[PDB]
């Protein structure tokens, strides 16, 4: 048989899908596999078909997406949450304001037949078996995962900060020489330190990691010298970790 792969969409910018779709010899790098649901490129997809690997992109932001992830979980052997939207609830997850206030601010008092929920990751409603990180994730994050799966192995995630990748390429640390509030120390690696490589601080697009190794002589020292309060770091980290209940503790520990 062939490995049945599907790709399914919650609420998202479709960028994670588009990154896959733009991988050029994509067909020639999944030769073991067949793509049985992917509505963005295939008019013949079927949603309630069972699959070996399910890729879900986006936050659970409607009542129908709730009942939907319970269907994919039921119909799929491996559930892979893909992207900052599906892994952490995304940039649409960093107001804490309740749904009504947001509904009222954008739509006025109007109503809509469908039911909007508060942005929420896939982990909130079903068991996720793997996460591919980033907003969007790299091409190599998909090559690696699709690659390791289609041989029978199981993929594993990088757990060290961007800073290792930034020093290896020799980028000047814009946190130090420039005092921009780079989230590298607390964002997992993988992107080849793209943003510091262009002279811009990292905004954490690949999800918070724990600062359990003194990669700075004193991150506390630099953070205070360049004038960035604990409240200022926690909020910048919310941009991509609006539901991470440890984020508050990792920062306070840093400033310890």
């Amino acid at each position: 048989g062939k490995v049945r792969i599907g790709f399914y969409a919650l609420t998202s910018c479709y960028g994670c899908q588009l990154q896959l779709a733009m991988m050029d010899e994509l067909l020639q790098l999944i030769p073991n596999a067949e793509i049985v649901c992917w509505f963005m490129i295939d008019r013949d997809s079927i949603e309630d078909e069972k699959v070996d690997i399910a890729f879900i992109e986006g936050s659970v932001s409607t009542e129908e997406e709730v009942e939907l992830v319970k269907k994919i979980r039921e119909n799929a052997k491996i559930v892979v949450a893909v992207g900052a939207c599906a892994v952490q609830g995304g940039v649409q997850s960093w107001s804490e304001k309740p749904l009504e206030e947001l509904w009222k601010k954008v739509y006025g008092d109007a109503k809509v037949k469908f039911q909007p929920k508060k942005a929420e990751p896939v982990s909130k409603y079903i068991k996720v078996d793997y996460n591919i990180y980033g907003c969007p994730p790299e091409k190599k994050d998909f090559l690696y995962a699709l690659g390791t799966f289609l041989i029978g192995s199981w993929p594993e995630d990088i757990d060290y900060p961007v800073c290792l990748e930034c020093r290896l390429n020799g980028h000047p640390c814009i946190l130090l020489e420039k005092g921009e509030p780079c989230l590298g120390p607390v964002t997992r690696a993988g992107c080849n330190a793209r943003c510091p490589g262009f002279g811009v601080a990292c905004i954490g697009c690949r999800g918070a990691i724990g600062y359990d190794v003194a990669w700075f002589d004193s991150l506390a020292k630099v953070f205070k010298e360049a004038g960035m309060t604990k409240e200022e770091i926690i909020e910048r980290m919310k941009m991509f970790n609006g539901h991470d209940e440890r984020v508050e503790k990792m920062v306070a520990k840093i400033f310890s």
Binding site: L27, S61, C135
Partner: protein, 419 residues
């Protein structure tokens, strides 16, 4: 017995079509836009201007750079910054980079399977080797442009307040001008391929076409006046005076009227209002095909995108020449977050994009966004009606194919429509 298309394939975002039919024929076409809302307009209220400026591109991946670059203009108008000549040039060129990649994506991977019998562009790889080879070269030019200048083809963190975080070596821009003018014959090929595709007469009728009038003297993306094809022209900050939105029960996106009627925005709307402003091979391809680029048919949208690919490929060889002649270029300038209000209207690949930003205390107090697909959703509903009326008694799966063909001609990015 309504006829429903639950999930429309080969568009961006989640959407459906449902046709209500009765004794008098077809009564109603509802485009069910279920793509959940993400409340961009609300949650960036009371966040710092750069923090929100970094998040506005996650509205949409196909038009990512259009979002970031239009929101930048608006913020840079609020705080009263003004860019520099060459920083604005390279801005227009990163935008063009998004024009080419989006157009090529849409013409080749989303539309063309319908005319070829294929459910999927992935499938026609071995029957249309030459065509896809050309698709991937044009798409990948545009993708390379956005990597070099924006840092990434999706979500361009190199475009910042005041200019760019880092500008490439001069040799790279010169290689871009090489890769550009090599693409020109591929852009023409595409025009010709699409010039020979059927503009189905069932949707032929009158359309109102709104486009941003370009400042300067060429077919462009930036400007301060919105023309309508009736012969009107109104200022971009007054967009709220001449264009009225409203919720509807079957959509998370907000419809829009101009003088109380549906209109359409995009590549054809720009060709209607602004074709005299072309030049280069685009001019002739327009002048030799005026009867294929009429305002009276949404399928004319597809060929106009092909015509635009040709133009912007030339338009960008000239814009780089401008930037290359302010060499060297300090990549960005200081920007004082003095309070202000700023409205910007650009042409995203799908039509007009309007960002309205207000800054109090270097924070965002007010934000208003309307995406070209949100404009278009009303016209789309009417054109599907005309299709579905000449075929509600045909075979359903056949009705389905042509309804969706109509929808795909707008190049809907639904994610843009529900921000």
């Amino acid at each position: 017995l309504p006829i429903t298309i639950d999930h429309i394939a080969r568009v961006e975002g989640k959407g459906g079509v449902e046709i209500i039919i009765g004794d008098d024929g077809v009564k109603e076409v509802k485009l069910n836009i279920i793509e959940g809302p993400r409340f961009f307009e609300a949650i960036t209220i009371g966040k710092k201007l750069e923090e929100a400026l970094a998040i506005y591109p996650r509205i949409c991946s196909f038009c990512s750079a259009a979002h970031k670059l239009t929101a930048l203009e608006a913020a840079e108008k609020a705080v009263g910054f003004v860019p520099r000549e060459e920083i604005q040039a390279l801005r227009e060129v990163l935008y063009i980079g998004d024009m080419i990649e989006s157009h090529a994506l849409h013409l080749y991977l989303l539309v063309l399977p319908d005319y070829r019998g294929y459910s999927s562009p992935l499938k026609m790889v071995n029957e249309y080797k030459r065509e896809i080879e050309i698709a991937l070269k044009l798409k990948n030019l545009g993708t390379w442009m956005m990597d070099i200048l924006g840092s990434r083809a999706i979500h361009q963190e190199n475009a910042v307040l005041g200019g760019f975080g880092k500008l490439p070596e001069k040799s790279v821009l010169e290689k871009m001008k090489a890769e550009l003018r090599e693409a020109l014959p591929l852009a023409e090929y595409t025009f010709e391929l699409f010039a020979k595709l059927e503009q189905y007469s069932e949707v032929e009728g009158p359309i109102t076409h709104l486009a941003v009038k370009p400042r300067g003297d060429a077919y462009g993306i930036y400007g301060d006046y919105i023309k309508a094809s009736d012969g009107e022209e109104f200022p971009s900050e007054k967009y709220r005076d001449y264009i009225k939105e409203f919720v509807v029960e079957h959509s998370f996106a907000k419809h829009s009227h101009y003088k109380g009627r549906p209109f359409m925005v995009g590549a054809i709307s720009r060709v209607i209002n602004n074709a005299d402003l072309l030049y280069g091979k685009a001019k002739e391809l327009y002048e030799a095909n005026k009867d294929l680029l009429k305002g009276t048919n949404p399928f004319a949208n597809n060929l106009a995108q092909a015509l635009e690919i040709v133009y912007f490929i030339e338009r960008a060889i000239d814009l780089l020449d401008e930037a290359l002649a302010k060499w060297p270029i300090k990549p960005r300038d200081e920007v004082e977050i003095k309070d202000g209000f700023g409205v910007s209207t650009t042409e995203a690949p799908r039509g007009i994009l309007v960002y309205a930003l207000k800054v109090e205390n270097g924070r965002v107090s007010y934000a208003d966004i309307i995406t070209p697909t949100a404009f278009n959703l009303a016209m789309m509903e009417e054109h599907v009606r005309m299709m579905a009326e000449k075929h509600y008694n045909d075979d359903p799966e056949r009705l389905k194919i042509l309804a969706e063909m109509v929808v795909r001609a707008y190049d809907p990015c639904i994610s843009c429509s529900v921000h």
